Symmetry: C3
C-alpha cells in the first residue's frame, strides 16, 4: 500500500519500488514542491515558501524541468540518464520540486545519511528527473534527493544591483536544502547529516554553497564532480549590466533603468523568454564575432546575499565553513560531450598550431586566455609533437585543464589549507552506456562517472562484471563519505586524504592512490595567468 | 426627511428613504455597500479581502453591478424571481462584492432589530442581490433585510483540487459578508446578536453549506434553506475536480502543464474572455447527444479543506457542527416548470413514455446523478403506475424534483434534528398570480413560487388578491418570528409543529395546516436505491 | 577620491565639482532613489520605501524625468535651466529620485541648513535635473536637494474615492521629505532645519504641504515662488469622477466602476498612458468647446489623506503648523512664458473689449471667472485706455493677478493672521538668460527669479556685474531665510516682515521695501467672485 508521509506543508503520497534482489522496498516520491511557483511577479525574486495543502498530495509524477532550450535539454538528459528508458519531460517556470528516494522503513524511525544531488547543464539546462536514485538508495542505504533550480534567464538574470541581484537559481538550491532540514526526518533521513553533490554546473553550485555563509548549517559533506567555483565560464566577474541590457534588448525591452528592464521582463511570457534564450545562442561557441563579447551562458554573480565577493577572495579568507570536501575530475573532461554540444570545428579530427591558436582565442569565453598568451599556452601543450591528431587531443587536454583540472586542484588546496578534510580523485573509465556517436578512444569523458555514482549498471542493460564492480565501489565510496566525511572502508582500496602530499585516488579499471594531481599544470597556468 | 447617513467601520454611507403604504416610518435603503475588496487581477481565485476604508460619504444609492454571468440567463431569472413591479436591468462586473440593506428602524434612535441575510439562488452560476427588494418584509415584519452578492461561476468556484486554487470563493464571499454584518449591522438598527441567513435553491444550498462549515460558526443564529440543501448533489462536486479544471483552462486557451500554471493563465484572462469561456462551456444546459456522465461537470461547491473538511454527508453524521434552529422546506412541484423551461428540457410534447423517460433520466445525469443501472427501478417506481403518457410525463417531473430537492431536504432535516437542534419543515403549495403566462395553469408550487410570499410581492406588484396578500402576510410573520425566536409560531398564526420524531411539518398554501412525515416513502425508496 | 556616503539603504558614490571662488569642492550625488519604483501594481498608490542595495551605488548619472510630454518637458527645462547647456533627459515611470548638492566637508560632522527644491511644470511636466544646485550650495553653504514626484496621470489620477484617491505626486514629495529626515545628516545636512521651496506648481505644492498634516514635522521654512494652494488651476474642487472617466475612456477602458477603471489603467503600458496624455491636450488653452469643460491639467484634489478639506477651509482654521513662510510673485507672471507655452491666441499682439471678453472666458479653467462676470473684469482692467496694444498688456496683468497676485496675497495674509512669520516679495527684473522669442519689454516674467535663486550667473555666460550682484543678494536672502526663518542679514537691504502694515520687498535693479502688494486688486476680485 502506497507510503504516505506528513511534511511541514501537508501529506505526500508516493509509491514503493523494488530493485531486483533487494527485499526492502524503496519509497519513491516524485514532484514534491519546496517553494512557491516563481510565476509572474515572483520571477527574478528569492524563492518563497510553498503554500500548505489540505489533504493528501499525490507525488507520483515527474515534475516539469525548468524552462530551457527543449532540444539541448532533452539531449543532455538522454546522455546523462542512468535509468533504462529516458523520460520525456515537460517545460515550465513552475519547476521548484525535488524527488526523494528512501530505503528507510517509514513505519519506523530512521536517520539514514542524506545525499542531495544537484544536476549540471551549464546553469542553462538540466533537470532532477534525469537522475533515478533507486540504485544508490538501495545499494548504500541512504536517502537520495534530486533537486531542481531555475535556469538561464529565469535563474540568473542580474542587473548587477538591488532591482535584480541575481543568483536566483542558487537561492533555489538553498531553499531545497532548507526544505530537507525541516522535512527529511519524515522520510527516514537524518537532517543532521546531509551531503551535497553535483556535477559540472552542479559541482560548481556545490562549490559556491561551500563558500556561501547562507548555506552554513545546511550541509555536512560536499562533493564537486568536474566543476568548482573557479570554473571561469560559470562565474561572471565584473560589470554584468551589459549582458543584462543585451538580454533586455533581445526580449524587446527598454534599458532606461534597471527597474524598467526587470519590470519589462516580468511582463514577458515564459515562451517569449524562451525565444529570447534561443536568440542569445547560449551553450554554443561563436566562430564569427569578437570572442571577448560572446556570452556562452548566464551564471553566478557576486550578488551580496549569497556571495559577498569573488570565490577567490573567499578562499584565502579561510572564512567559509569547513566540511569534508571531495573534489574530482575526469581524465578527458573536454574529450567529447562538451565540444560536441557546443559544435566545436573539429570535423577533421586534426589540428595544427595556427588553427589551435585561433580556436583557443575563439573559445575565450571558456578559458579567458589573453590573446597575447595564446602562443605560450598552445606551444606548451601542442609544441612537443608534430602529430596533428595528437595536437588536437592535447588541445582538448589544454581546455580541460584550464576549465576543470587546475581550478579543482586549486580549490582542493585552499579547502585543505583551511584545515578541513579534503579528498580528490580522477575518474578514468569509459562507460558502456556512452553515446554511439562518441569516439571509442575517449576515456573518462565529462559525465562518465555519473553512471557509476548512480548505479547505471543496475538499472540499464549490458554492464560487464568490471563495470558493475566499478559502480559498487564508487557508490560505497560516495556513501561512506556521506556518513563519515571519509570514503574509506573495508573491502575498498585505500583513498589517501588530500593533504600536503596531495595524494588522490585514480578511479577506473584499476583503482589506486597516486599523488600530486595536475601539479605541473597548476604551476604553469597560475604563472601564465599572472602575466 | 433628509437622506439617512450611517457611519460604518470603513466609512460613512448615504442611503435614501422609501415609504410603503401602511407604514409611517420611512424605510432606509442603502444600495451597493462594499463588504470586501474588489476581487480583480491577482485577487481573482483568492479568498475575499477586507474592503479599503473611504474618506467621506460614500453614496450607496445605485444598484451595484452583478457578478459576471450569462447576461441573458441572469436577466431572465431576475425577471422571474423579482418581487418588484418592474425588473431592474443590471450591469456585469467582477467588482460585484456588495450588499443591499433595507432597515425600517428610525436611524435617529437606538434600534436592535433581528437581521435577515438573503442569499440568492441561480445554480451558483447566475443571480443578483438587486433582484430582491426587501422593502416589504422589512417594514411589515420590522426586521433589517440584507441581500448579498458573491462570485459566481468560474470566478467564484474555479477549482484545481489543490492549494493553487482550492475553490468555493463564492462561499468565502458569503462568510465575508456575514462577518461584515456582525461588525456594521448595528449602525443600521440591526441586532448583530440575531442574524438569520436564508436563501433558496443555490442560496439554500449555500445556507445549508454555511450551517456545516466551521468558518461560519458564530456569524448567524438561525438558518433557512428554501428548496435546496447540501445534499442537492448537482451543486456539490465529490471526487477529482482536476479534469473539469483542465477542460476550463483549455476552453479559455491556457496550458495545463500544472495547476499553478493553469491558475496563473486564467488570472491573466480578461472578464470578457472568461465570459466567452463560460458561454462555450454551455452550463445550465442539458446535453442530449454526448455521454451523460461527462455531460458537463457543473461548476459548484467542493471539499476544499477550508470551508468544508469533508463531504456534507460525513459532516451531518458528525453532530459536530454548531447547532442553530434550522428551517428546511420545499415547494410542491420543484421541477414543475421553471427549471425544465430554463434548461430547455426535451418535454415539448407534454407526453412521455417509459422508454423515453429512461433516456431523459439518463441524459439528465448531472441533475439527479442516477446510475444508468438504476434508471429502470426508479422509472418504474414513478411511471409504471399509469398508462396515460401525459400522467407519466408529470410523474417524471415529480421524480426529478424528489431526487434533487424533496428527499435531500428531509434527510438534512432529520440529521439536523437528530443532532439535537430545533428543526422545522414546510411544503409550500400555491400558484402566485405573478407567475409568467407561459406557465401551465396546472402547476402549483413551482420552483421559486414561495419567493413572492416571503418577499411580499403582493405589496409591490399589482393585482394581488386578498387570499394572496393574506398568504404573504402569514409567511413573513412566520419567517420573522423564526428570525427573532428560532421558532416560527406566534399569535394569529396556525400551529407549526416542530420537526421532531413525529416529523410534523407545515403545509403552506390557501389552506395552511400541519401534517406529518413529508416524503417519508420517497426517502426510504431512494435511500434504498442509491444504496445499490 | 570620489565621496562615498552611508545612507539607511546603502552606500552612494558621488563626485566632486569645484566652483571658481571656493576651495572646498561640492559633493554632488545624482539619482538617489527615495522610494520603490512605482511600476505595475504600485501605480496609483502611495510611494513605498526603496529596497536596500548591497554594495556601492553610483549616484553619478542624471535620473529620468517622470513620464510626460517629452517636447513640452524639454522646452520648459531649456527655458528654466540655470546651467550653461541644458541636459537631455530620458522619460520613465521609474522617476522617484532626488539630487543632492552638499558643500560640507564630509570628513567631519556638519549640520548645514537643508533646502529642498520642488520644480514646477503644472504637475504635468518638469524634472529635478533641470536645476543645478552647485552655485547656491557653495555660495551660501547649504545642502541643496532637488526632488522629483510623479506627474500627470501617474501622479494625479483620482477617481474621487478609496480606489484611487489621487495626490500621488504630493505623497511622493512627502516621501522625499521623510527620506531627508532620515538620511540628510550623512550628507552634512541638518534634518532639524529643512526649507522647502518651489515655483509655480512647485510653489503650489509647497503651499499644499504647509496645509497638510502628512508633512507636519518634515520641514521648518517654506517658500512659494509664483504659486500657492489658492492658484485655482492646480486644485480640483467638486466631482472629479468626470475627468477620471474621460481619461479612462481615452485610454480605452470601461467605466463600469472606479475599481475597474483603476485596474484597467494599472495595466496600460507607459507608452499607452503617454499617448492618452498627449491626446488629452493638457497645458493647452482649448479654443473650440465649452470653457467650463476643458481640462488644462490634472492636479491636487481633496483626497482625505493629504488634504482633509479645501485650502480655503484649511487657512481659516489656524490649525496647520505655523512655519516661517515666504510667498512671492513676479511683476509679469503672464508676460510671455505661460501664454507662449499654452499657445495663447495673442498672435495679433493687440486686443479689444470684444476679443478680451471671449478670451477671458475660453481661459475659464485658469481664472475661473464666470461668464456673467467677464464684463466687470474686462472693464476694470481694459476700460482705462483705448490703446488696443495697452489692452492686451493689461489683459496679461489681469490673468496674472487672478492666477498669482491675488491668491498669493490672500495666502500670505492668512498665514500672518494665523500668527506665523510671513514674508513677501515682488520680483521685477529681466534676466539676460531670457529667450530671443521673448519681447524685451517683458520684465519679471514667470520664473524669472529662478536665475537669481539658483545662481545662473555663476554657471551660464554673459552675466553683467549687476545681474551677478542681484543673484548673490537673492541667494543670501533665501539662504538666510533657511537658517533663521528671517531673510535679513548684515549688508542686505532691509526686508520688512509681512504683518498688518503688509510690508514686502521689491527685488530688482533697485531692491527696496514697499507696502500693501496687490492690496487693491485683492479687494476688487474678492468682491467680484463673491457673486
Ligand atoms: O563530430 C564529428 C566527427 O568529428 C570527429 C573527427 O572526424 O571527432 C572530432 O569532433 C568531436 C566532437 O564531436 C571531438 O570530441 C573529437 O575529439 C574530434 O576529433 C569524429 O570522431 C566525429 O564523429
Ligand atoms: O405553455 C408552455 C408550453 O410548454 C410546454 C412544451 O414546451 O410544456 C412542457 O415543458 C414545460 C417546461 O418547459 C413543463 O413544465 C410542462 O409540463 C411540459 O408539458 C407545453 O406543454 C406548455 O403548454
Ligand atoms: O506668436 C504670438 C506673437 O504675439 C506677439 C505679438 O506679436 O506677442 C504676444 O503673444 C505671445 C505669445 O507667445 C506673448 O508671450 C506675448 O506676451 C504677447 O504680447 C509676439 O511677440 C509673438 O511672437
Ligand atoms: C496530475 C498531475 O500531473 N499533477 C500531479 C501533481 C504534480 O504534477 C506532481 O506530482 C508534483 O506535485 O502533483 C499532485 O499530487 C499535486 O500537486 O497535488 C497532483 C497530481 O498528482
Ligand atoms: C456602477 C456602480 O454600481 N458603481 C457606482 C458606485 C458603487 O457601485 C456604489 O457604492 C454602489 O452602487 O458608487 C457610485 O454610484 C457613487 O457613489 O456615485 C458611482 C458608481 O456608479
Ligand atoms: C541604470 C544606469 O545605467 N544608470 C545608473 C543608475 C542610477 O542610479 C540611475 O540611473 C539614476 O540616475 O544606477 C547606478 O547609479 C548604480 O546603481 O550603480 C549607476 C548607473 O550608471
Ligand atoms: C493519485 O493522484 C490522483 C490525482 O492526480 C488521484 O486521483 C489518485 O487517487 C491518486 N492515487 C492514489 C493516492 O492511489
Ligand atoms: C450620489 O453621490 C453624489 C456625490 O457622492 C451626491 O451628490 C448624491 O447626493 C448621491 N446620491 C444622491 C443622488 O442623492
Ligand atoms: C561606480 O563607480 C566606479 C568608479 O568609482 C565605476 O568604476 C563603476 O563603473 C560605477 N558603477 C557602475 C555604474 O558600473
Ligand atoms: P556542465 O554543467 O557545463 C559546465 C560548463 N554540462 C556539460 C553538464
Ligand atoms: P437554483 O439555484 O438551482 C439549484 C440547482 N435556480 C433554479 C434558481
Ligand atoms: P507653472 O507650474 O504653472 C502654474 C499654474 N508652469 C508655467 C511652469
Amino acid at each position: 500500500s502506497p507510503p504516505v508521509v506528513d511534511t511541514v506543508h501537508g501529506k505526500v503520497l508516493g509509491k514503493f519500488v523494488s530493485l531486483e534482489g533487494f527485499a526492502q522496498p524503496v519509497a519513491i516520491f516524485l514532484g514534491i514542491p519546496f517553494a512557491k511557483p516563481p510565476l509572474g511577479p515572483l520571477r527574478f525574486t528569492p524563492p518563497q515558501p510553498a503554500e500548505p495543502w489540505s489533504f493528501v498530495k499525490n507525488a507520483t509524477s515527474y515534475p516539469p524541468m525548468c524552462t530551457q532550450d527543449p532540444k539541448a535539454g532533452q539531449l543532455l538528459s538522454e546522455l546523462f540518464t542512468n535509468r533504462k528508458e529516458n523520460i520525456p519531460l515537460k517545460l515550465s517556470e513552475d519547476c521548484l520540486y525535488l524527488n526523494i528516494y528512501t530505503p528507510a522503513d517509514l513505519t519506523k524511525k530512521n536517520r539514514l545519511p542524506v545525499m542531495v544531488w544537484i544536476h549540471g547543464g551549464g546553469l542553462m539546462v538540466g533537470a532532477a528527473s534525469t537522475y533515478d536514485g533507486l540504485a544508490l538508495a538501495a545499494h548504500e542505504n541512504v536517502v537520495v534527493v534530486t533537486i531542481q533550480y531555475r535556469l538561464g534567464i529565469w535563474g540568473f538574470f542580474s542587473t548587477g544591483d538591488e532591482h535584480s541581484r541575481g543568483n536566483w537559481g542558487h537561492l533555489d538550491q538553498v531553499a531545497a536544502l532548507r526544505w530537507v532540514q525541516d522535512n527529511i526526518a519524515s522520510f527516514g533521513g537524518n537532517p543532521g547529516s546531509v551531503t551535497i553533490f553535483g556535477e559540472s554546473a552542479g559541482g560548481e553550485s556545490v562549490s559556491v554553497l561551500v563558500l556561501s555563509p547562507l548555506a552554513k548549517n545546511l550541509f555536512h559533506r560536499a562533493i564537486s564532480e568536474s566543476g568548482v567555483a573557479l570554473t571561469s565560464v560559470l562565474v561572471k566577474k565584473g560589470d554584468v549590466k551589459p549582458l543584462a541590457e543585451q538580454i533586455a534588448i533581445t526580449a524587446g525591452c527598454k534599458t532606461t533603468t534597471s527597474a524598467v528592464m526587470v519590470h519589462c521582463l516580468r511582463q514577458k511570457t515564459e515562451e517569449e523568454l524562451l525565444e529570447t534564450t534561443l536568440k542569445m545562442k547560449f551553450l554554443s561557441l561563436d566562430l564569427q564575432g569578437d570572442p571577448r563579447e560572446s556570452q556562452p551562458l548566464l551564471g553566478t554573480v557576486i550578488d551580496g546575499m549569497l556571495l559577498l565577493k569573488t570565490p577567490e577572495e573567499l578562499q584565502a579568507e579561510r572564512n567559509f565553513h569547513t566540511v569534508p570536501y571531495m573534489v574530482g575530475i575526469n581524465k578527458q573532461e573536454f574529450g567529447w560531450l562538451i565540444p560536441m554540444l557546443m559544435s566545436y570545428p573539429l570535423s577533421e579530427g586534426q589540428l595544427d598550431q595556427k588553427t589551435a591558436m585561433s580556436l583557443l582565442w575563439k573559445s575565450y569565453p571558456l578559458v579567458c586566455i589573453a590573446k597575447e598568451l595564446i602562443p605560450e599556452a598552445t606551444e606548451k601543450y601542442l609544441g612537443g609533437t608534430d602529430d596533428t591528431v595528437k595536437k588536437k587531443d592535447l588541445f582538448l587536454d589544454l581546455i580541460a585543464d584550464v576549465m576543470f583540472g587546475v581550478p579543482s586542484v586549486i580549490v582542493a588546496r585552499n579547502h585543505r589549507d583551511a584545515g578541513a578534510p579534503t579528498y580528490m580523485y580522477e575518474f578514468q573509465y569509459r562507460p558502456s552506456f556512452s553515446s554511439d556517436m562518441k569516439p571509442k578512444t575517449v576515456i573518462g569523458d565529462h559525465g562518465d562517472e555519473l553512471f557509476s555514482v548512480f548505479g547505471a549498471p543496475f538499472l540499464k542493460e549490458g554492464a560487464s562484471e568490471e563495470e558493475i564492480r566499478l559502480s559498487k565501489m564508487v557508490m560505497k565510496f560516495w556513501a561512506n563519505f556521506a556518513r563519515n566525511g571519509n570514503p574509506n572502508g573495508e573491502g575498498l582500496p585505500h583513498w589517501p586524504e588530500y593533504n600536503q602530499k596531495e595524494g588522490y585516488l585514480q578511479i577506473g579499471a584499476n583503482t589506486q592512490a597516486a599523488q600530486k594531481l595536475k601539479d605541473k599544470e597548476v604551476a604553469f597556468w597560475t604563472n601564465l595567468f599572472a602575466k
